C-alpha cells in the first residue's frame, strides 16, 4: 500500500483537457501536502515546514493563498489515476491535477474506456510520482494523452466515447 496516494468516487469532467483531470481540493491538498509546504515556503504564506503543516493542520486553516500555492505546485505535475481492477497497461494513466469543488475524483470521459471505468459508484486510486524522473515518465509515457492508442491492439483506446459519439453523430 502506497504513501503518496488517494482515492474517491469518480465523476466525469468534461471541462478538463485529456492531459488533466479533476481532483477534490481535499484530495489535491493531501496528495501534494509536502509539495504545498514547499511552495508555501517559496511564497509568502508559511515560514518553514512545521509552520506550513500547522498551516494545513485543521479544516478552517485553508485559505486563498494556500489553494493558490497548491495550484502553483500541481501546475506541470501529474497524478497517476488507476481503476480497480487493473487489467492492462492503460489501467493507470497520468493526468495534470485540476482542483475541483466536491469530494469526488473528476475523471476525463475519454479514458473511461481505457480504464474500463463507469460512473456508477466506481472508485479510483490516485498516486503522485514524487521524483522528477518518475514525474517525467509519468507525463511522458503514462500521460493519458500520450497513450491514445491501445498498446494491445494499436487501436485508439482514447477514442470519443459514448456521449461524444452521440452528439457528433447527431
Amino acid at each position: 500500500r502506497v504513501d503518496y496516494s488517494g482515492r474517491s468516487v469518480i465523476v466525469v469532467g468534461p471541462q478538463l483537457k485529456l492531459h488533466q483531470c479533476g481532483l477534490p481540493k481535499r484530495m489535491a491538498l493531501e496528495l501534494f501536502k509536502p509539495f504545498l509546504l514547499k511552495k508555501m515556503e517559496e511564497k509568502g504564506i508559511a515560514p518553514n515546514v512545521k509552520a506550513a503543516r500547522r498551516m494545513l493542520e485543521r479544516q478552517r486553516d485553508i485559505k486563498d493563498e494556500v489553494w493558490d500555492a497548491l495550484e502553483e505546485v500541481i501546475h506541470g505535475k501529474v497524478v497517476l489515476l488507476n481503476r480497480a481492477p487493473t487489467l492492462h497497461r492503460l489501467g493507470i494513466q497520468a493526468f495534470q491535477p485540476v482542483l475541483v469543488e466536491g469530494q469526488s475524483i473528476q475523471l476525463h470521459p475519454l479514458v473511461c474506456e481505457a480504464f474500463n471505468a463507469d460512473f456508477d459508484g466506481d472508485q479510483m486510486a490516485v498516486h503522485v510520482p514524487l521524483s522528477s524522473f518518475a514525474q517525467a515518465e509519468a507525463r511522458i509515457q503514462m500521460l493519458s494523452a500520450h497513450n491514445l492508442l491501445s498498446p494491445a491492439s494499436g487501436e485508439p483506446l482514447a477514442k470519443p466515447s459514448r456521449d461524444i459519439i452521440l452528439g457528433l453523430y447527431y
Binding site: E137, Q141, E155
Partner: protein, 144 residues
C-alpha cells in the same frame, strides 16, 4: 480472442509462446555439463554447443521441448521469480546447491529487488544517458 470480438496484436501472443518455446530437453549429455532429461533454455544450450563445438567437444543433442506457461515459468533460471511462486525452499535449495549466476534480467526478478526494472527507463540502453549545454560542454572541452 477473435471469437469474442477482441482483436489484440499477434505480437504479444508470439512473445508468450516464445517464452514457452525457450526450454529444451537433452537427448545426449555429450561433453557438456548437462545430462539426459535436464531442462534448460534454447539459447543457453545453443551457446554451450557453439562453445563446445568450437572447442573440439561433442555438442548437445537437444530435443525441442514445449512446456506450459506456468511450467515454463516454474523451470526458469530466475530462481527469484521461481522462489516467488511456490515452495521457495525447494527453489532456493536447488539453486544454491549450484552457484547460480542469476542475471537481474527480468522485471519480476528485479521488483523483489527494488532497482530500476530492466524496462523503459531502467533499460541499460536508455538509463545511461546524459544531458548538457554548450555553456557546459565548452568548459568541458577546455580542460580536456
Amino acid at each position: 480472442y477473435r471469437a469474442q470480438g477482441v482483436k489484440l496484436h499477434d505480437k504479444h501472443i508470439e512473445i508468450v509462446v516464445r517464452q514457452m518455446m525457450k526450454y529444451v530437453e537433452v537427448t545426449d549429455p555429450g561433453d557438456s555439463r548437462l545430462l539426459e532429461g535436464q531442462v534448460l533454455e534454447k539459447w543457453d544450450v545453443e551457446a554451450l554447443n557453439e562453445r563446445l563445438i568450437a572447442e573440439g567437444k561433442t555438442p548437445v543433442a537437444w530435443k525441442p521441448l514445449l512446456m506450459g506457461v506456468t511450467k515454463s515459468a516454474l523451470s526458469t533460471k530466475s530462481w527469484l521469480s521461481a522462489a516467488s511462486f511456490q515452495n521457495t525452499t525447494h527453489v532456493l535449495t536447488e539453486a544454491a546447491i549450484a552457484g547460480k549466476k542469476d542475471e537481474l534480467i527480468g522485471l519480476k526478478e528485479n521488483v523483489i529487488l527494488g532497482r530500476l526494472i530492466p524496462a523503459g527507463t531502467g533499460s541499460d540502453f536508455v538509463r545511461f544517458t546524459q544531458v548538457v549545454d554548450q555553456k557546459t560542454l565548452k568548459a568541458i572541452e577546455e580542460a580536456r
